[PDB]
Design an enzyme around this catalytic site. Structure first.
Site, PDB file in Angstrom:
ATOM      1  N   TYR A   1       0.799  -1.215   0.000  1.00  0.00           N
ATOM      2  CA  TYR A   1       0.000   0.000   0.000  1.00  0.00           C
ATOM      3  C   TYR A   1       0.832   1.267   0.000  1.00  0.00           C
ATOM      4  CZ  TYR A   1       0.740  -0.256   5.125  1.00  0.00           C
ATOM      5  OH  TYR A   1       1.275  -0.346   6.391  1.00  0.00           O
TER       6      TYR A   1
ATOM      7  N   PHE B   1       2.950   9.795   3.034  1.00  0.00           N
ATOM      8  CA  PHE B   1       3.635   9.685   4.314  1.00  0.00           C
ATOM      9  C   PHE B   1       4.041   8.241   4.602  1.00  0.00           C
ATOM     10  CE2 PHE B   1       0.111   7.838   6.689  1.00  0.00           C
ATOM     11  CZ  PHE B   1      -0.993   8.237   5.963  1.00  0.00           C
ATOM     12  N   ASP B   2       3.300   7.294   4.041  1.00  0.00           N
ATOM     13  CA  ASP B   2       3.601   5.881   4.223  1.00  0.00           C
ATOM     14  C   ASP B   2       3.604   5.198   2.866  1.00  0.00           C
ATOM     15  OD1 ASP B   2       2.794   3.800   7.043  1.00  0.00           O
ATOM     16  OD2 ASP B   2       3.919   3.246   5.247  1.00  0.00           O
TER      17      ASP B   2
ATOM     18  N   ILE C   1      -6.691   1.560  12.245  1.00  0.00           N
ATOM     19  CA  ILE C   1      -7.837   2.451  12.334  1.00  0.00           C
ATOM     20  C   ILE C   1      -9.078   1.752  11.789  1.00  0.00           C
ATOM     21  CG2 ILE C   1      -6.418   4.530  12.225  1.00  0.00           C
ATOM     22  CD1 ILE C   1      -6.925   4.819   9.357  1.00  0.00           C
TER      23      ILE C   1
ATOM     24  N   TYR D   1      -7.819   9.130  12.551  1.00  0.00           N
ATOM     25  CA  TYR D   1      -7.359   9.805  13.761  1.00  0.00           C
ATOM     26  C   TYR D   1      -8.412  10.778  14.288  1.00  0.00           C
ATOM     27  CZ  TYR D   1      -2.876   7.926  12.214  1.00  0.00           C
ATOM     28  OH  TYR D   1      -1.860   7.088  11.804  1.00  0.00           O
TER      29      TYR D   1
ATOM     30  N   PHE E   1      -5.703   5.869   0.799  1.00  0.00           N
ATOM     31  CA  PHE E   1      -4.858   4.686   0.834  1.00  0.00           C
ATOM     32  C   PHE E   1      -4.955   3.886  -0.454  1.00  0.00           C
ATOM     33  CE2 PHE E   1      -4.675   5.458   5.393  1.00  0.00           C
ATOM     34  CZ  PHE E   1      -3.374   5.086   5.685  1.00  0.00           C
TER      35      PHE E   1
END
Length: 117
Positions: A38, A48-49, A67, A93, A109
């Protein structure tokens, strides 16, 4: 020839799923160990990921360190399919303003399921 509706669809809250690649295989439920790859981007396109190059991430649904947008959006995922998941703040979040990721953050995502055990 299977109609999985390759468009944008609505899950719990306001979670949108866009099925990029036609994936028909084992369905991911809770207790199921899924292995995926992913790319985690923000609504602005800020990545960021990420894991793509030979990096499989394996996790099982029902755990409490992911999450709810994941535990829910991944529910019914199929090995071989890719879908871009849009996760609104409430299912991620929410009201927590992290560095780079402030409250009311909309996570995007890019996820595809490549394994399940």
């Amino acid at each position: 020839g299977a109609m999985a509706k390759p468009k944008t669809k609505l899950l719990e809250g306001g979670i949108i799923i866009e099925d990029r690649v036609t994936g028909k295989g084992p369905h991911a439920k809770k207790g199921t160990r899924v292995g995926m790859r992913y790319v985690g981007k923000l609504k602005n396109g800020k990545v960021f990921d990420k894991n793509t190059k030979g990096k499989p991430f394996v996790f099982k649904l029902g755990q409490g360190e992911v999450i709810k947008g994941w535990d829910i959006g991944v529910a019914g995922m199929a090995v071989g399919g890719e879908r871009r998941i849009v996760i609104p703040a409430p299912y991620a979040y929410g009201k927590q303003a992290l560095p780079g990721i402030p409250a009311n953050s909309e996570l995007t995502f890019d996820v595809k399921l490549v394994s399940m055990k």
